[PDB]
């Protein structure tokens, strides 16, 4: 049902009831079997483009069928078009990628070498990352690696933790291993 | 898709239902005279 | 079942008029994240919007409808709510026709007008729903007043169908 | 806002106003805040080779200091002296952050 | 009957109409949901095919370079490795920074 | 679906006109640039009609606000941030900084 908003689905049912009653009303007190039940069947068939065993014979009855057909044709094509757009966009990352976006928040450990690396950095990407990190609220920084690990695990993919590759590799192997190292190493150093 | 995107097709459908009701009253009076 | 058929119509006619007239009067159509006078949970109806929690709880304001013909006409219709009020008057006249049908059996066309009044009243309400939703867009949920109005549409159409059924049965037994 | 009620050097407000006040206090000098007449930051027209704006005001001697957001550039450093930067920045892009019958 | 029900259902799923239609409330409910099932499934088949046929129709990987899992390497202790190491061109510097750190 | 960030986005398109402040460090930075992107941007800006340039930052701010998102103003990040904060704040900084400097 996502290809159409919930309001559109509600109004399609409201329009369906209105067309069925109006088609029944103008078919009964007219010169020249569209009962209330038959009108609902014909209107349902027209919306699903399946056709029925009867068609209106009066000019007043045929106008109702004509517009209801136009409403059905636009809506069914709208559902197919929006579903295709919805599926094709879904079919269509690293440090730079993490720096460009803002949907995922990324932090470091407080009073750590990584925070010091970002603070004193002069590379464009890392300077941008630091300018973001210093201002971010709530604080993206953590007090312990465990805190950052829990924050990535409980942020449901909205938090990216910047930590040392050794701890990262160790954690990515630990159960439930629901974390993943993404991209390469931002620099090279040693203990 | 929101209702604002296809709000036009709803006005035509309601407009057509109103016109069809008006035609029947015209036809009824002509056929009743 | 003619007695119960008229009983359904008169009960439904009152309920359709009752359920919709409350929707216009009350102010719980939409639960949006708005402001009453800082931003606070608010409940907005067709005319006034009021905060739902906090210090300024219960402080309502008139909805300011106005901040080019295509969008001027859309908000002008929504400003005065011509369609939701129009369906109330059509429902009011339809109820009068139903009540006057029992008070004067000379002409059977009176109950037919009640069916046309109620069927037309339903159509005017759908336009009120489409216009209100379209103008609202230009996180939210709909309150009971909006669902009160939508339930008045189903009742009005069903009473309209039954009112025509009474007229059809009345004329068919005379001719046949 | 409502500068008519105020008069003299205290006619203005802003970051550089307080910065000029603090620099004046630390250096120990009195000063009069003159707005540049051209209303330009500064550049030399390559044809006339003439400096306009605040840089022109400083070079020609009509002003003794400039406490505006004046960017440190190589061409300006060749004609006027700059202190250490009091604010960092970069060139940036700004942006000014369904009809009926559209079916 | 049993044979006409199979023919009607197959016709309804193919959106090709039918020789007969149900006349009872119980039969029309079965026809109604089967009609709705047919509309969603075929729309799903047409919408997903599109995507496949679109996402597909849609120094590149060496423009930004690889950009992608298309890891690219060089020979060790060769003039090409040395060329990439000592390069100062934006693309080549990006390529070298990637190649030296990639694991 | 076609109805489903950087320096190139402006250089690459031509539907949005982008200008700078006249007699300013940004104009001079673009004029004397030798970087391919910035040289392309300068060649466009120098020969653009109507003049993309403006006389004051307020002029560029109102131009972006009243160009209905058809004008991209190139200004210093500090002013950009200040404007994007003050009401009606219908403007936004896009991407990073083209360079780094200070006042």
Residue numbers in the entry:
A (entry chain B): 514 to 545, 566 to 625, 630 to 728
B (entry chain C): 783 to 815
C (entry chain G): 5 to 41, 55 to 84, 92 to 162, 172 to 209
D (entry chain C): 406 to 502, 508 to 513
E (entry chain A): 568 to 625, 630 to 674
F (entry chain C): 621 to 624, 630 to 728
Paper text:
AMPA glutamate receptors (AMPARs), the primary mediators of excitatory neurotransmission in the brain, are either GluA2 subunit-containing and thus Ca2+-impermeable, or GluA2-lacking and Ca2+-permeable. AMPA glutamate receptors (AMPARs) mediate rapid signalling throughout the brain, and orchestrate various forms of synaptic plasticity that underlie learning. These cation channels assemble in various combinations from four core subunits, GluA1–4, with each contributing unique gating kinetics, trafficking and subsynaptic localization. AMPARs exhibit a modular architecture with a two-layer extracellular region connected to the transmembrane ion channel (transmembrane domain, TMD). The ion channel is encircled by diverse auxiliary subunits, modulating receptor gating kinetics, pharmacology and ion flux, with the transmembrane AMPAR regulatory proteins (TARPs γ2, γ3, γ4, γ5, γ7, γ8) being the most abundant.
Here we determine and characterize cryo-electron microscopy structures of the GluA1 homotetramer, fully occupied with TARPγ3 auxiliary subunits (GluA1/γ3). Desensitized GluA1/γ3 substantially deviates from this behaviour and, despite the limited NTD and LBD resolution of this highly dynamic state, we could trace major transitions throughout the receptor. First, the GluA1 LBDs splay into pseudo four-fold symmetry in some 3D classes, reminiscent of desensitized kainate receptors, and of GluA2 receptors lacking auxiliary subunits. Second, the NTD dimers translate into a parallel configuration, where some classes adopt an ‘O-shape’ conformation, as described for heteromeric GluA2/3 and GluA2/4 NTDs. Interestingly, these transitions take place despite the presence of TARPs, whose extracellular loops remain associated with the LBDs, and accompany their motions. As apparent in 3D classes, transition of the LBDs towards four-fold symmetry largely involves rotation of the B/D subunits. The B/D LBDs undergo up to 90° rotation along an axis perpendicular to the M1 gating linkers, with the M3 and M4 linkers accommodating this motion. The appearance of non-domain-swapped receptors reaches approximately 30% and is greatest in the class closest to four-fold symmetry. Together with a study implicating subtler GluA2 LBD rearrangements in desensitization, a complete rupture of the LBD dimer interface may lead to deeply desensitized states. Closer analysis of the three sets of desensitized structures reveals a gradual transition of the LBD tier into four-fold symmetry, which is greatest for GluA1 and smallest for the edited GluA2 mutant: GluA1 > GluA2(F231A)-Arg743 > GluA2(F231A)-Gly743.
